[PDB]
């Protein structure tokens, strides 16, 4: 018997900036149909790890495989098909319409079914009424939905195929409502299609609620890997977080809840 899995594997990733190990020895794996969360305090290098798993930043000593093949040997097109990344800062200084911006996501696919993909994606991220609008004029949440739409459009295929969506740390003016909404959407997508989400959250509650596994990164090292309950306990929180945080139980769910002491 064999249990084959679509796996993003990371073996001993190191990343130094001038002899300073920003990411020390880190090994992990994100599996298809799983919602993983990188957490940790400032300076831990979460963004650096994300950018290591995403193939953007070259590892120093370690390797980083995707579907059994090293990211080095992966070709730009196919990779662009398999893995997509959403950041929440928007750097558009020119009047692109929301449709143009999302359609820009269809880049790796030679114009094939761009209309279908855009229709579905924009339908499910709640745009459509935003389609013919200056991207710059959009409010924060609308930008959230449009960026989410861009990435989902890049990750649209007519077949059931394993793909990876990375979600960089949220911008700061973005309310709880929109973070929650996005994480819910991606959460259920994880159950439906073969999709692996890997997001970087600062909020411990959001990671507890919407992640299957959670990965506590501190000082470039992985100091915790497991369920929200295996990681988000009072001991480890006090250990790595400075705020006076404690762990209780969620009144409604069977998940840990992190609270502030008076």
């Amino acid at each position: 018997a064999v249990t084959p899995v679509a796996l993003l594997e990371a073996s001993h990733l190191h990343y130094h900036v001038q002899q300073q190990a920003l990411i020390n020895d880190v090994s992990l794996h994100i599996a298809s149909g799983e919602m993983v969360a990188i957490i940790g305090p400032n300076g831990a290098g979460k963004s650096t790890l994300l950018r290591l798993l995403t193939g953007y930043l070259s590892p120093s000593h370690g390797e980083c495989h995707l579907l059994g093949q090293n990211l080095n040997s992966w070709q730009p097109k196919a990779l662009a098909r398999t893995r997509a990344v959403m950041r929440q800062y928007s750097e558009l200084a020119f009047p692109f319409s929301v449709s143009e911006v999302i359609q820009m996501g269809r880049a790796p696919y030679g114009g094939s079914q761009d209309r279908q993909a855009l229709q579905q994606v924009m339908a499910q991220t709640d745009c459509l009424a935003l389609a013919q609008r200056d991207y710059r004029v959009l409010s924060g949440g609308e930008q959230q939905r449009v960026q989410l739409a861009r990435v989902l459009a890049q990750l649209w295929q007519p077949q059931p195929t394993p793909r990876w969506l990375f979600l960089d740390e949220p911008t700061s003016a973005l309310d709880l409502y929109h973070q929650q909404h996005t994480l819910r959407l991606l959460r259920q997508l994880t159950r439906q299609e073969p999709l692996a989400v890997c997001c970087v959250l600062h909020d411990l509650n959001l990671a507890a609620l919407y992640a299957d596994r959670i990965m506590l990164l501190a000082q470039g090292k992985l100091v915790a890997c497991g369920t929200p309950e295996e990681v988000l306990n009072a001991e480890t929180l006090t250990q790595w977080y400075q705020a006076d945080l404690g762990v209780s139980r969620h009144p409604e769910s069977a998940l840990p809840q992190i609270y502030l002491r008076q």
Partner: protein
């Protein structure tokens, strides 16, 4: 908004009307006027397209050839080739200066946090530097070379000939086509370097090729015209306010609108006053200035 094909058609018949009408406005007509009108068209196209590629590459609404101080660098290299194939020495010289300052401004826009400020400040510094250097030399050494060069760096097409126009257009017309093939990368690069890298775009290649592209453009345009600084600022905004910022329709639209606007500015330069060939650049600086202050406000 407006359909792209209509805007292109309108700008094209406008270009034709403007050329014929300015020719209107026999060795004179064949060997002076025709190639000066044509030089206004080709240079206007060069600055328009270059300003558009530039603005794209730096992700800046304000990235012009003669405002980042790339033009001034090219011109100063021309001067350094005169103090010490001739048109080719001007081409290669101005292209060296252009590519050099262009590479500086490119470096500074990428590695520092994206700020229009910083770039335009480097612009001010370089422009003030060269602008000072020229007048200084006007006070140091005296000959026809330096006066003619001082009036020439002001930006003028008073010296339009067929050989210059030929070499210039032989460098510019294929580079404007090469700018058009790159319009896809130029669109995806708008999202950000990393963002575009994720979509498959070879960001390094696109960055280099674009830098190069606009360097060749400005090199030629400057080494034949001098220093003009709004045909790369204003025309792309004008076309872009009536087409999507999509570079497939943006590039060519600018190329025709640049030829239009420079030609209107040159034809108006040699005509606005009784037998007085004032440099184009006085007119572009004059018109484009308080227009640009209006944009801010």
């Amino acid at each position: 908004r407006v359909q792209p094909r209509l805007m292109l058609g309108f700008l094209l018949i406008l270009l034709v009307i403007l050329a014929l009408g300015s020719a209107n406005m026999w060795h004179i007509w064949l060997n002076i006027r025709l190639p000066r009108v044509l030089l206004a068209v080709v240079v206007g196209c060069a600055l328009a397209v270059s300003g558009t590629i530039m603005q794209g590459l730096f992700r800046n609404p304000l990235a012009d050839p003669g405002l980042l101080g790339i033009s001034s660098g090219a011109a100063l290299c021309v001067g350094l080739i005169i103090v010490m194939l001739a048109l080719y020495s001007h081409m290669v010289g101005a292209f060296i200066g252009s590519l050099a300052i262009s590479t500086i401004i490119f470096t500074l826009s990428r590695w520092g946090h994206g700020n229009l400020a910083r770039l335009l400040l480097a612009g001010i510094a370089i422009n003030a530097l060269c602008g000072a250097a020229v007048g200084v030399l006007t006070y140091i050494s005296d000959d026809q070379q330096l006066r003619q060069f001082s009036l020439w760096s002001m930006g003028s097409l008073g010296q339009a000939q067929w050989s210059t126009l030929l070499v210039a257009s032989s460098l510019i017309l294929p580079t404007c086509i090469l700018g058009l093939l790159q319009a896809r990368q130029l669109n995806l690069l708008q999202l950000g370097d990393e963002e575009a890298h994720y979509l498959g775009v070879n960001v390094r290649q696109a960055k280099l090729r674009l830098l190069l592209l606009s360097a060749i453009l400005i090199g030629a345009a400057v080494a034949v015209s001098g220093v003009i600084g709004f045909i790369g600022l204003v025309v792309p905004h004008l076309i872009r306010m009536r087409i999507g910022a999509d570079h497939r329709w943006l590039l060519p639209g600018a190329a025709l609108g640049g030829a239009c606007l420079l030609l209107t500015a040159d034809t108006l330069a040699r005509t606005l006053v009784a037998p007085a060939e004032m440099p184009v650049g006085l007119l572009t600086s004059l018109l484009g200035g308080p227009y640009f202050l209006w944009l801010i406000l």
